[PDB]
Amino acid sequence: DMVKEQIYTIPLREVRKVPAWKRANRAVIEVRGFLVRHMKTESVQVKLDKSINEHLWEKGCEKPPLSIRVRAVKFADGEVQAELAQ
RNA sequence: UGUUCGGGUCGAAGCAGGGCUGUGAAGUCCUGUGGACCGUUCACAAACGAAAAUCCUGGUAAUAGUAGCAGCAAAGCAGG
Numbered sequence A: 001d002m003v004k005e006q007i008y009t010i011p012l013r014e015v016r017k018v019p020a021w022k023r024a025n026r027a028v029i030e031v032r033g034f035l036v037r038h039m040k041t042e043s044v045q046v047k048l049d050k051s052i053n054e055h056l057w058e059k060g061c062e063k064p065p066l067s068i069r070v071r072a073v074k075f076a077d078g079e080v081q082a083e084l085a086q
Numbered sequence B: 001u002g003u004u005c006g007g008g009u010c011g012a013a014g015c016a017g018g019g020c021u022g023u024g025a026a027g028u029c030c031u032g033u034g035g036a037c038c039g040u041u042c043a044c045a046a047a048c049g050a051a052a053a054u055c056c057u058g059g060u061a062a063u064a065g066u067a068g069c070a071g072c073a074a075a076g077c078a079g080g
């Protein structure tokens, strides 16, 4: 069950260095890598709620937000449930 | 091919590498492989000897893990 519950505020400023239309994929990869290194788990262990995917693709694939605030959960079996914090 | 004398499953031809002979074309022997045919005297024949033809046919290098997999319609991400 609950072993590590904390709210994060992932910055996405390095995402804005790739070409314009490839920014959303890079945003997804960046969020996943942030959670991987701040939760100490393998890459596959990380799961993303559809709210995060909705938020990153709100304004097309060229204008991802410059920040995002998530609320992740860690379980003993390994999985991490990241869902969009308010 | 005609003729004389022979060899071979106790291992013929062929192939790889060596020893000796000959100025040389080449001959003969030894070792490994191979599994069925091959020589020699005297003569006679020829669809008879290749390193080259921007030669012919087949096999195979370097170039090289290289060019290309962009240009006219830049399309995908999350969960299951």
Ligand SMILES: [Mg+2]
Pocket (backbone or CB within 6 Å): none
């Ligand atoms: Mg030739």
